[PDB]
Amino acid sequence: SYPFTVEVMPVPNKVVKGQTVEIRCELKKEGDFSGTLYTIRYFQFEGEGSLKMDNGITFLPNDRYLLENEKFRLYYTAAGDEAHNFIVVVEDNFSNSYELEFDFNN
């Protein structure tokens, strides 16, 4: 809510094994203050797959990566047909976070 949010464009409600989903995101700064440096991380709770940043880096769960651009894309490649659920968390250097949750095939 404050001091930032992350807007996400539409994503599919389903994926098949080997399909890559493009997730388009934009960091929105909601106030006058806070937020010079941002990181991104993810964690997967259901299903098998890999998540990559638009700079080609593959996320390792829970590791934090520098977010260089306000507008960025993520790429989720499913490794099976079972249901997928994962969260992506963006954090600033002032203890603020914003969580996105993705569900495919449920």
N, CA, C and O atoms as CSV, one atom per row, in Angstrom:
chain,resi,resn,atom,element,x,y,z
A,1,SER,N,N,0.814,-1.273,0.000
A,1,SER,CA,C,0.000,0.000,0.000
A,1,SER,C,C,0.843,1.318,0.000
A,1,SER,O,O,0.779,2.093,-0.954
A,2,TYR,N,N,1.616,1.550,1.064
A,2,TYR,CA,C,2.679,2.568,1.069
A,2,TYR,C,C,3.964,1.903,1.522
A,2,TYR,O,O,3.922,0.894,2.227
A,3,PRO,N,N,5.116,2.456,1.125
A,3,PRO,CA,C,5.292,3.571,0.235
A,3,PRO,C,C,5.391,3.129,-1.237
A,3,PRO,O,O,5.596,3.979,-2.104
A,4,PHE,N,N,5.253,1.834,-1.544
A,4,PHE,CA,C,5.202,1.376,-2.961
A,4,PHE,C,C,4.305,0.180,-3.164
A,4,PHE,O,O,4.004,-0.556,-2.224
A,5,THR,N,N,3.877,-0.010,-4.411
A,5,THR,CA,C,3.127,-1.165,-4.818
A,5,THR,C,C,3.780,-1.684,-6.104
A,5,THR,O,O,4.644,-1.025,-6.682
A,6,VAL,N,N,3.364,-2.853,-6.535
A,6,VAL,CA,C,3.827,-3.399,-7.785
A,6,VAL,C,C,2.580,-3.788,-8.600
A,6,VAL,O,O,1.779,-4.614,-8.162
A,7,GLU,N,N,2.429,-3.192,-9.769
A,7,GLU,CA,C,1.319,-3.496,-10.645
A,7,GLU,C,C,1.714,-4.623,-11.558
A,7,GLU,O,O,2.856,-4.690,-12.012
A,8,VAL,N,N,0.781,-5.511,-11.832
A,8,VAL,CA,C,1.083,-6.671,-12.689
A,8,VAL,C,C,-0.013,-6.768,-13.739
A,8,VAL,O,O,-1.200,-6.650,-13.438
A,9,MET,N,N,0.413,-6.985,-14.976
A,9,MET,CA,C,-0.546,-7.147,-16.073
A,9,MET,C,C,-1.129,-8.521,-16.034
A,9,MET,O,O,-0.640,-9.377,-15.296
A,10,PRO,N,N,-2.185,-8.771,-16.824
A,10,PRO,CA,C,-2.806,-10.093,-16.816
A,10,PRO,C,C,-1.837,-11.244,-17.108
A,10,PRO,O,O,-0.901,-11.107,-17.896
A,11,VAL,N,N,-2.086,-12.374,-16.455
A,11,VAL,CA,C,-1.379,-13.617,-16.679
A,11,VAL,C,C,-2.395,-14.723,-16.958
A,11,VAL,O,O,-3.561,-14.597,-16.586
A,12,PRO,N,N,-1.963,-15.811,-17.611
A,12,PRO,CA,C,-2.855,-16.934,-17.844
A,12,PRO,C,C,-3.342,-17.548,-16.537
A,12,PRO,O,O,-2.745,-17.342,-15.480
A,13,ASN,N,N,-4.435,-18.304,-16.623
A,13,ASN,CA,C,-4.913,-19.051,-15.449
A,13,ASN,C,C,-4.427,-20.504,-15.478
A,13,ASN,O,O,-4.666,-21.264,-14.540
A,14,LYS,N,N,-3.750,-20.880,-16.557
A,14,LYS,CA,C,-3.230,-22.244,-16.734
A,14,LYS,C,C,-1.908,-22.243,-17.484
A,14,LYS,O,O,-1.587,-21.304,-18.212
A,15,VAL,N,N,-1.153,-23.308,-17.293
A,15,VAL,CA,C,0.127,-23.483,-17.950
A,15,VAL,C,C,0.305,-24.972,-18.199
A,15,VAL,O,O,-0.269,-25.797,-17.488
A,16,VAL,N,N,1.096,-25.318,-19.205
A,16,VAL,CA,C,1.447,-26.703,-19.417
A,16,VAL,C,C,2.953,-26.842,-19.236
A,16,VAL,O,O,3.692,-25.857,-19.238
A,17,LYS,N,N,3.387,-28.079,-19.081
A,17,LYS,CA,C,4.793,-28.391,-18.935
A,17,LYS,C,C,5.570,-27.789,-20.093
A,17,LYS,O,O,5.222,-27.977,-21.258
A,18,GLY,N,N,6.626,-27.062,-19.756
A,18,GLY,CA,C,7.500,-26.450,-20.735
A,18,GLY,C,C,7.061,-25.084,-21.239
A,18,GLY,O,O,7.832,-24.406,-21.918
A,19,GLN,N,N,5.839,-24.663,-20.922
A,19,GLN,CA,C,5.376,-23.337,-21.245
A,19,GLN,C,C,6.014,-22.276,-20.379
A,19,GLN,O,O,6.203,-22.472,-19.179
A,20,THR,N,N,6.349,-21.148,-20.990
A,20,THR,CA,C,6.887,-20.009,-20.269
A,20,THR,C,C,5.853,-18.903,-20.262
A,20,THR,O,O,5.357,-18.505,-21.316
A,21,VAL,N,N,5.523,-18.403,-19.078
A,21,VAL,CA,C,4.584,-17.314,-18.883
A,21,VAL,C,C,5.355,-16.022,-18.663
A,21,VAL,O,O,6.262,-15.965,-17.832
A,22,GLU,N,N,4.992,-14.981,-19.413
A,22,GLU,CA,C,5.625,-13.671,-19.258
A,22,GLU,C,C,4.796,-12.833,-18.284
A,22,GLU,O,O,3.601,-12.632,-18.501
A,23,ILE,N,N,5.420,-12.346,-17.220
A,23,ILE,CA,C,4.728,-11.595,-16.209
A,23,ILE,C,C,5.272,-10.173,-16.253
A,23,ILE,O,O,6.456,-9.958,-15.993
A,24,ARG,N,N,4.421,-9.192,-16.580
A,24,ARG,CA,C,4.854,-7.824,-16.733
A,24,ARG,C,C,4.486,-7.004,-15.508
A,24,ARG,O,O,3.321,-6.905,-15.123
A,25,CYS,N,N,5.515,-6.421,-14.910
A,25,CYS,CA,C,5.404,-5.746,-13.618
A,25,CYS,C,C,5.879,-4.308,-13.721
A,25,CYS,O,O,6.715,-3.967,-14.558
A,26,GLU,N,N,5.325,-3.469,-12.847
A,26,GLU,CA,C,5.780,-2.105,-12.698
A,26,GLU,C,C,5.724,-1.667,-11.247
A,26,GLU,O,O,4.679,-1.742,-10.601
A,27,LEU,N,N,6.865,-1.206,-10.741
A,27,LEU,CA,C,6.945,-0.633,-9.408
A,27,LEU,C,C,6.298,0.764,-9.433
A,27,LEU,O,O,6.640,1.589,-10.279
A,28,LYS,N,N,5.365,1.026,-8.505
A,28,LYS,CA,C,4.683,2.298,-8.376
A,28,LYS,C,C,5.013,2.885,-6.994
A,28,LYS,O,O,4.701,2.281,-5.968
A,29,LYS,N,N,5.636,4.048,-6.978
A,29,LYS,CA,C,5.947,4.712,-5.703
A,29,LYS,C,C,4.795,5.635,-5.337
A,29,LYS,O,O,4.446,6.550,-6.082
A,30,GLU,N,N,4.211,5.370,-4.165
A,30,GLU,CA,C,2.902,5.898,-3.746
A,30,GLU,C,C,2.922,7.184,-2.938
A,30,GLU,O,O,1.870,7.773,-2.691
A,31,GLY,N,N,4.104,7.633,-2.521
A,31,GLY,CA,C,4.207,8.814,-1.687
A,31,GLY,C,C,5.381,9.683,-2.076
A,31,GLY,O,O,6.061,9.434,-3.072
A,32,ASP,N,N,5.608,10.717,-1.264
A,32,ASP,CA,C,6.726,11.645,-1.427
A,32,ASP,C,C,8.082,11.042,-1.028
A,32,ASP,O,O,9.119,11.470,-1.534
A,33,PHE,N,N,8.078,10.057,-0.130
A,33,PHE,CA,C,9.311,9.643,0.549
A,33,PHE,C,C,9.633,8.148,0.374
A,33,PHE,O,O,8.867,7.396,-0.228
A,34,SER,N,N,10.787,7.747,0.917
A,34,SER,CA,C,11.292,6.362,0.895
A,34,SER,C,C,11.533,5.765,-0.507
A,34,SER,O,O,10.916,6.180,-1.488
A,35,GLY,N,N,12.442,4.787,-0.571
A,35,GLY,CA,C,12.613,3.923,-1.748
A,35,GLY,C,C,13.656,4.271,-2.801
A,35,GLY,O,O,13.304,4.645,-3.920
A,36,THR,N,N,14.940,4.152,-2.456
A,36,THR,CA,C,16.014,4.270,-3.467
A,36,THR,C,C,16.383,2.901,-4.075
A,36,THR,O,O,16.496,2.783,-5.295
A,37,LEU,N,N,16.569,1.878,-3.241
A,37,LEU,CA,C,17.058,0.590,-3.706
A,37,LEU,C,C,16.020,-0.499,-3.473
A,37,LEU,O,O,15.427,-0.584,-2.397
A,38,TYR,N,N,15.807,-1.328,-4.485
A,38,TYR,CA,C,14.824,-2.403,-4.389
A,38,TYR,C,C,15.429,-3.724,-4.764
A,38,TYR,O,O,16.313,-3.806,-5.617
A,39,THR,N,N,14.937,-4.771,-4.108
A,39,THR,CA,C,15.282,-6.143,-4.426
A,39,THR,C,C,14.024,-6.942,-4.725
A,39,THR,O,O,12.910,-6.531,-4.400
A,40,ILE,N,N,14.229,-8.088,-5.351
A,40,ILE,CA,C,13.180,-9.036,-5.654
A,40,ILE,C,C,13.622,-10.470,-5.318
A,40,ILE,O,O,14.788,-10.836,-5.464
A,41,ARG,N,N,12.652,-11.255,-4.868
A,41,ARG,CA,C,12.848,-12.630,-4.526
A,41,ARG,C,C,11.564,-13.373,-4.786
A,41,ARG,O,O,10.516,-12.764,-5.005
A,42,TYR,N,N,11.642,-14.701,-4.763
A,42,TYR,CA,C,10.443,-15.524,-4.899
A,42,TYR,C,C,10.523,-16.789,-4.058
A,42,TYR,O,O,11.595,-17.181,-3.597
A,43,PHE,N,N,9.377,-17.416,-3.870
A,43,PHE,CA,C,9.308,-18.729,-3.262
A,43,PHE,C,C,8.157,-19.495,-3.857
A,43,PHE,O,O,7.083,-18.939,-4.087
A,44,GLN,N,N,8.374,-20.775,-4.109
A,44,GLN,CA,C,7.340,-21.639,-4.676
A,44,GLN,C,C,6.752,-22.563,-3.673
A,44,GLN,O,O,7.472,-23.268,-2.967
A,45,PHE,N,N,5.420,-22.572,-3.596
A,45,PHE,CA,C,4.674,-23.364,-2.639
A,45,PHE,C,C,3.975,-24.601,-3.213
A,45,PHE,O,O,3.797,-25.596,-2.511
A,46,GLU,N,N,3.582,-24.538,-4.487
A,46,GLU,CA,C,2.976,-25.696,-5.164
A,46,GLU,C,C,3.565,-25.775,-6.566
A,46,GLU,O,O,3.801,-24.750,-7.206
A,47,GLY,N,N,3.799,-26.996,-7.039
A,47,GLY,CA,C,4.199,-27.191,-8.421
A,47,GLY,C,C,5.681,-27.067,-8.628
A,47,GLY,O,O,6.433,-26.742,-7.710
A,48,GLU,N,N,6.093,-27.334,-9.858
A,48,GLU,CA,C,7.504,-27.343,-10.232
A,48,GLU,C,C,7.716,-26.410,-11.407
A,48,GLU,O,O,6.920,-26.392,-12.346
A,49,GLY,N,N,8.786,-25.637,-11.356
A,49,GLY,CA,C,9.028,-24.655,-12.405
A,49,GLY,C,C,10.222,-23.816,-12.041
A,49,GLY,O,O,10.822,-23.983,-10.979
A,50,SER,N,N,10.562,-22.906,-12.941
A,50,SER,CA,C,11.665,-21.990,-12.750
A,50,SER,C,C,11.224,-20.584,-13.079
A,50,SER,O,O,10.401,-20.368,-13.969
A,51,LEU,N,N,11.777,-19.629,-12.354
A,51,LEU,CA,C,11.435,-18.243,-12.565
A,51,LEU,C,C,12.710,-17.532,-12.950
A,51,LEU,O,O,13.750,-17.730,-12.322
A,52,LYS,N,N,12.639,-16.700,-13.983
A,52,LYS,CA,C,13.788,-15.923,-14.446
A,52,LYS,C,C,13.426,-14.462,-14.549
A,52,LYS,O,O,12.263,-14.111,-14.748
A,53,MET,N,N,14.431,-13.607,-14.414
A,53,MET,CA,C,14.364,-12.153,-14.571
A,53,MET,C,C,14.664,-11.852,-16.015
A,53,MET,O,O,15.244,-12.684,-16.713
A,54,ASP,N,N,14.279,-10.673,-16.482
A,54,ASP,CA,C,14.478,-10.248,-17.863
A,54,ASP,C,C,15.944,-10.007,-18.199
A,54,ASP,O,O,16.282,-9.774,-19.360
A,55,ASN,N,N,16.812,-10.060,-17.200
A,55,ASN,CA,C,18.255,-10.037,-17.444
A,55,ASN,C,C,18.867,-11.435,-17.585
A,55,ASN,O,O,20.090,-11.571,-17.625
A,56,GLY,N,N,18.031,-12.467,-17.661
A,56,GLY,CA,C,18.488,-13.840,-17.889
A,56,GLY,C,C,18.811,-14.640,-16.638
A,56,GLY,O,O,19.057,-15.843,-16.720
A,57,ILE,N,N,18.813,-13.988,-15.479
A,57,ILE,CA,C,19.170,-14.661,-14.204
A,57,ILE,C,C,17.988,-15.518,-13.736
A,57,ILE,O,O,16.839,-15.076,-13.741
A,58,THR,N,N,18.300,-16.743,-13.337
A,58,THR,CA,C,17.308,-17.644,-12.747
A,58,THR,C,C,17.270,-17.432,-11.247
A,58,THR,O,O,18.307,-17.432,-10.584
A,59,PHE,N,N,16.065,-17.251,-10.712
A,59,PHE,CA,C,15.895,-17.066,-9.278
A,59,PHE,C,C,16.209,-18.360,-8.542
A,59,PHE,O,O,15.760,-19.432,-8.948
A,60,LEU,N,N,16.975,-18.266,-7.464
A,60,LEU,CA,C,17.017,-19.339,-6.475
A,60,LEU,C,C,16.068,-18.927,-5.359
A,60,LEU,O,O,16.126,-17.786,-4.901
A,61,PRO,N,N,15.196,-19.827,-4.907
A,61,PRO,CA,C,14.217,-19.425,-3.876
A,61,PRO,C,C,14.835,-18.730,-2.665
A,61,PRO,O,O,15.848,-19.165,-2.116
A,62,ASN,N,N,14.189,-17.639,-2.271
A,62,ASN,CA,C,14.585,-16.831,-1.114
A,62,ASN,C,C,15.802,-15.897,-1.303
A,62,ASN,O,O,16.016,-15.012,-0.475
A,63,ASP,N,N,16.585,-16.072,-2.351
A,63,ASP,CA,C,17.718,-15.168,-2.616
A,63,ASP,C,C,17.152,-13.855,-3.129
A,63,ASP,O,O,16.153,-13.839,-3.848
A,64,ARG,N,N,17.795,-12.750,-2.757
A,64,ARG,CA,C,17.380,-11.430,-3.188
A,64,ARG,C,C,18.274,-10.905,-4.319
A,64,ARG,O,O,19.495,-11.058,-4.291
A,65,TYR,N,N,17.639,-10.294,-5.295
A,65,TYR,CA,C,18.309,-9.758,-6.471
A,65,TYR,C,C,17.950,-8.296,-6.617
A,65,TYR,O,O,16.826,-7.882,-6.333
A,66,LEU,N,N,18.924,-7.519,-7.065
A,66,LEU,CA,C,18.720,-6.113,-7.317
A,66,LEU,C,C,17.714,-5.919,-8.441
A,66,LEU,O,O,17.783,-6.567,-9.485
A,67,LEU,N,N,16.780,-5.012,-8.197
A,67,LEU,CA,C,15.829,-4.625,-9.193
A,67,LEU,C,C,16.338,-3.323,-9.790
A,67,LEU,O,O,16.392,-2.299,-9.108
A,68,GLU,N,N,16.710,-3.363,-11.055
A,68,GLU,CA,C,17.403,-2.239,-11.687
A,68,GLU,C,C,16.459,-1.252,-12.353
A,68,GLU,O,O,16.774,-0.068,-12.479
A,69,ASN,N,N,15.303,-1.740,-12.777
A,69,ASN,CA,C,14.338,-0.953,-13.514
A,69,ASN,C,C,12.971,-0.977,-12.838
A,69,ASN,O,O,12.584,-1.993,-12.262
A,70,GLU,N,N,12.236,0.137,-12.904
A,70,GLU,CA,C,10.860,0.203,-12.397
A,70,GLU,C,C,9.919,-0.722,-13.146
A,70,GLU,O,O,9.044,-1.344,-12.543
A,71,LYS,N,N,10.096,-0.815,-14.464
A,71,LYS,CA,C,9.322,-1.737,-15.288
A,71,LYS,C,C,10.190,-2.931,-15.594
A,71,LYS,O,O,11.307,-2.789,-16.093
A,72,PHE,N,N,9.674,-4.117,-15.294
A,72,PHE,CA,C,10.430,-5.330,-15.508
A,72,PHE,C,C,9.520,-6.482,-15.780
A,72,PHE,O,O,8.329,-6.450,-15.468
A,73,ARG,N,N,10.100,-7.516,-16.373
A,73,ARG,CA,C,9.374,-8.707,-16.715
A,73,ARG,C,C,10.021,-9.929,-16.035
A,73,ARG,O,O,11.240,-10.007,-15.883
A,74,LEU,N,N,9.174,-10.862,-15.641
A,74,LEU,CA,C,9.577,-12.161,-15.129
A,74,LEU,C,C,9.050,-13.225,-16.062
A,74,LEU,O,O,8.063,-13.025,-16.770
A,75,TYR,N,N,9.727,-14.360,-16.051
A,75,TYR,CA,C,9.396,-15.488,-16.923
A,75,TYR,C,C,9.324,-16.775,-16.101
A,75,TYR,O,O,10.330,-17.234,-15.561
A,76,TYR,N,N,8.122,-17.352,-16.011
A,76,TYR,CA,C,7.917,-18.592,-15.278
A,76,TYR,C,C,7.746,-19.716,-16.281
A,76,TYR,O,O,6.824,-19.709,-17.096
A,77,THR,N,N,8.655,-20.686,-16.207
A,77,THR,CA,C,8.591,-21.866,-17.054
A,77,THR,C,C,8.138,-23.041,-16.212
A,77,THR,O,O,8.838,-23.467,-15.293
A,78,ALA,N,N,6.963,-23.564,-16.532
A,78,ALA,CA,C,6.467,-24.745,-15.837
A,78,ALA,C,C,7.278,-25.990,-16.164
A,78,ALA,O,O,7.658,-26.224,-17.311
A,79,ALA,N,N,7.535,-26.784,-15.129
A,79,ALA,CA,C,8.200,-28.080,-15.290
A,79,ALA,C,C,7.245,-29.260,-15.153
A,79,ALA,O,O,7.654,-30.406,-15.338
A,80,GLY,N,N,5.975,-28.995,-14.831
A,80,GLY,CA,C,4.876,-29.969,-15.072
A,80,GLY,C,C,3.472,-29.394,-15.264
A,80,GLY,O,O,3.288,-28.186,-15.411
A,81,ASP,N,N,2.487,-30.299,-15.259
A,81,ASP,CA,C,1.066,-29.983,-15.514
A,81,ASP,C,C,0.238,-29.795,-14.225
A,81,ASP,O,O,-0.891,-29.308,-14.276
A,82,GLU,N,N,0.808,-30.184,-13.075
A,82,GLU,CA,C,0.191,-29.988,-11.749
A,82,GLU,C,C,0.040,-28.499,-11.423
A,82,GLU,O,O,0.616,-27.654,-12.108
A,83,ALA,N,N,-0.726,-28.180,-10.391
A,83,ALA,CA,C,-0.985,-26.788,-10.044
A,83,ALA,C,C,0.263,-26.082,-9.550
A,83,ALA,O,O,1.114,-26.670,-8.884
A,84,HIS,N,N,0.352,-24.794,-9.897
A,84,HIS,CA,C,1.491,-23.973,-9.560
A,84,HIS,C,C,1.051,-22.827,-8.682
A,84,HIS,O,O,0.018,-22.200,-8.918
A,85,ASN,N,N,1.856,-22.561,-7.656
A,85,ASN,CA,C,1.650,-21.422,-6.781
A,85,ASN,C,C,2.983,-20.923,-6.274
A,85,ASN,O,O,3.782,-21.686,-5.731
A,86,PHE,N,N,3.219,-19.632,-6.455
A,86,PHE,CA,C,4.445,-19.012,-5.981
A,86,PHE,C,C,4.190,-17.577,-5.673
A,86,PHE,O,O,3.248,-16.970,-6.183
A,87,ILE,N,N,5.045,-17.025,-4.821
A,87,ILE,CA,C,4.979,-15.618,-4.470
A,87,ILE,C,C,6.244,-14.928,-4.918
A,87,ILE,O,O,7.315,-15.534,-4.949
A,88,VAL,N,N,6.122,-13.664,-5.265
A,88,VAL,CA,C,7.248,-12.812,-5.621
A,88,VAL,C,C,7.159,-11.651,-4.652
A,88,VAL,O,O,6.086,-11.078,-4.467
A,89,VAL,N,N,8.274,-11.297,-4.033
A,89,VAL,CA,C,8.298,-10.219,-3.067
A,89,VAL,C,C,9.336,-9.190,-3.464
A,89,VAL,O,O,10.500,-9.511,-3.702
A,90,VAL,N,N,8.888,-7.948,-3.531
A,90,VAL,CA,C,9.756,-6.820,-3.774
A,90,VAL,C,C,9.908,-6.087,-2.462
A,90,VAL,O,O,8.937,-5.859,-1.742
A,91,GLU,N,N,11.144,-5.720,-2.162
A,91,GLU,CA,C,11.465,-5.055,-0.929
A,91,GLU,C,C,12.338,-3.840,-1.167
A,91,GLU,O,O,13.181,-3.840,-2.065
A,92,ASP,N,N,12.140,-2.811,-0.370
A,92,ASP,CA,C,13.041,-1.650,-0.412
A,92,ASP,C,C,14.050,-1.754,0.710
A,92,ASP,O,O,14.101,-2.760,1.417
A,93,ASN,N,N,14.856,-0.711,0.878
A,93,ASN,CA,C,15.877,-0.702,1.911
A,93,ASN,C,C,15.379,-0.016,3.199
A,93,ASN,O,O,16.178,0.465,4.003
A,94,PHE,N,N,14.054,0.021,3.381
A,94,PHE,CA,C,13.414,0.651,4.535
A,94,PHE,C,C,12.370,-0.264,5.171
A,94,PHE,O,O,11.421,0.205,5.799
A,95,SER,N,N,12.556,-1.579,5.001
A,95,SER,CA,C,11.705,-2.618,5.601
A,95,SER,C,C,10.314,-2.725,4.984
A,95,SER,O,O,9.436,-3.367,5.560
A,96,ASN,N,N,10.100,-2.114,3.833
A,96,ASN,CA,C,8.806,-2.221,3.193
A,96,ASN,C,C,8.868,-3.342,2.170
A,96,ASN,O,O,9.895,-3.566,1.529
A,97,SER,N,N,7.753,-4.039,2.031
A,97,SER,CA,C,7.643,-5.136,1.079
A,97,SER,C,C,6.295,-5.121,0.377
A,97,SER,O,O,5.329,-4.540,0.871
A,98,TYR,N,N,6.244,-5.769,-0.783
A,98,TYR,CA,C,4.993,-5.929,-1.487
A,98,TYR,C,C,5.049,-7.302,-2.099
A,98,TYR,O,O,6.011,-7.656,-2.779
A,99,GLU,N,N,4.002,-8.082,-1.851
A,99,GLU,CA,C,3.943,-9.461,-2.271
A,99,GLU,C,C,2.946,-9.679,-3.390
A,99,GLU,O,O,1.811,-9.206,-3.335
A,100,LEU,N,N,3.387,-10.402,-4.405
A,100,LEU,CA,C,2.537,-10.852,-5.498
A,100,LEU,C,C,2.389,-12.352,-5.446
A,100,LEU,O,O,3.372,-13.060,-5.230
A,101,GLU,N,N,1.180,-12.856,-5.639
A,101,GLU,CA,C,0.969,-14.299,-5.599
A,101,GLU,C,C,0.462,-14.754,-6.945
A,101,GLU,O,O,-0.452,-14.149,-7.504
A,102,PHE,N,N,1.048,-15.818,-7.474
A,102,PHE,CA,C,0.646,-16.359,-8.745
A,102,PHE,C,C,0.126,-17.762,-8.589
A,102,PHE,O,O,0.708,-18.578,-7.874
A,103,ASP,N,N,-0.986,-18.047,-9.270
A,103,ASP,CA,C,-1.591,-19.387,-9.287
A,103,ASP,C,C,-1.882,-19.791,-10.696
A,103,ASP,O,O,-2.510,-19.037,-11.439
A,104,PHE,N,N,-1.434,-20.984,-11.096
A,104,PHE,CA,C,-1.755,-21.516,-12.408
A,104,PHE,C,C,-2.272,-22.950,-12.248
A,104,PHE,O,O,-1.711,-23.747,-11.496
A,105,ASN,N,N,-3.340,-23.256,-12.965
A,105,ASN,CA,C,-4.071,-24.542,-12.889
A,105,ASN,C,C,-4.804,-24.687,-11.530
A,105,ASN,O,O,-5.018,-25.801,-11.052
A,106,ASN,N,N,-5.181,-23.551,-10.926
A,106,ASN,CA,C,-5.876,-23.429,-9.610
A,106,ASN,C,C,-5.509,-22.116,-8.908
A,106,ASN,O,O,-5.993,-21.848,-7.808
